[PDB]
């Protein structure tokens, strides 16, 4: 049974709602372990307090750059970056959780949550999970995006950890 993580999402400091994710650790164990450990903050760094710095409506919400907060940063629990584990899972629709990267084998901490079917991302980004509960929160985050990704309000991970 797959690990489960949650995020409490907030906008300009005020609660929005909790989103929960199943992580497909059977298919991509190292990539799922990275995201889970970063969500509990058990190695002393991770997602708590960081921002969704790039939201593009009809596309995805991207966060996880906890070092530089604009997409130029981030790190994994394996070091600066780790390899693409496989591309077994594909971008089949809304709620898919996938690794943002700067090219092959440059997975760090940045991730995205798809708000549509993003087929052309197949084989480029590692898919490692899916939204289990709270797709309405991600649909409500979309509102605060823009076509170039800049957000009109600070969308933050107020808190996070492991449910299961």
């Amino acid at each position: 049974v797959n690990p489960t993580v949650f995020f409490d999402i907030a906008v300009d400091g005020e609660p929005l709602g909790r989103v929960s994710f199943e992580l497909f650790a059977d298919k991509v164990p190292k990539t799922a372990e990275n995201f889970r450990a970063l969500s509990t903050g058990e190695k002393g760094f991770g997602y708590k307090g960081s921002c969704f710095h790039r939201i593009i409506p009809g596309f995805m919400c991207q966060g996880g750059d906890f070092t530089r907060h604009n997409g130029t940063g981030g790190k994994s629990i394996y070091g600066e970056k780790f390899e693409d584990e496989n591309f077994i899972l594909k971008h089949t629709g809304p709620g898919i959780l996938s690794m943002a990267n700067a090219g092959p084998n440059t997975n760090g901490s940045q991730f995205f949550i798809c708000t549509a079917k993003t087929e052309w991302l197949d084989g480029k980004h590692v898919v490692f999970g899916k939204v289990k509960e709270g797709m309405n929160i991600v649909e409500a985050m979309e509102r605060f995006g823009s076509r170039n990704g800049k957000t009109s309000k600070k969308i933050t991970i107020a808190d996070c950890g492991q449910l299961e």
């Binding site: 593009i56 596309f59 995805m60 991207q62 750059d65 604009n70 997409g71 130029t72 981030g74 996938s98 943002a100 990267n101 700067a102 440059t106 760090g108 940045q110 995205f112 993003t118 052309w120 991302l121 480029k124 980004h125 990704g149």
Partner: protein, 146 residues
């Protein structure tokens, strides 16, 4: 070059062989004297980085000078990367990756990506930026020719 068509938009046209030849003839007569810098800049309006490299790769001789130039373009490419850190993706449909140094100089970018940057809205003017680099390079190598 990139140009406007009857319907409104900017579209690619191939470099004129007559432009190329004019450039070739300026170098034969003047070498790399100062006066070639304004010539180059006039002859390269709206040029893509691929056009700019065609112009440079037509020059016969002046090998010392051409290496100097390439080394100067290479410094500017590295400095561009130093000042424009890469932003992690995914690329939205209609969008393009952000150009690296190597892309602006035409080494790692195809003509279609160059057209892509130069015709986006807002435009990333990889032609104009590369031309700036080249013109700095020319302003260095013209020392060998007073």
């Amino acid at each position: 070059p990139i140009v406007q068509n009857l319907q409104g938009q900017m579209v690619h046209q191939a470099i004129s062989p007559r432009t190329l030849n004019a450039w070739v003839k300026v170098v034969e007569e003047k070498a790399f004297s100062p006066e070639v810098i304004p010539m180059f800049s006039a002859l390269s309006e709206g040029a893509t980085p691929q056009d700019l490299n065609t112009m440079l790769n037509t020059v016969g001789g002046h090998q010392a000078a051409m290496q100097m130039l390439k080394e100067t373009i290479n410094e500017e490419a590295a400095e561009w990367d130093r000042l424009h850190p890469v932003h992690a993706g995914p690329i939205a449909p209609g969008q393009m990756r952000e150009p690296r140094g190597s892309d602006i100089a035409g080494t790692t970018s195809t003509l279609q990506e160059q057209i892509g940057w130069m015709t986006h809205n807002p435009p990333i003017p990889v032609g104009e930026i590369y031309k700036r680099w080249i013109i700095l390079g020319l302003n260095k190598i013209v020392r060998m020719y007073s």
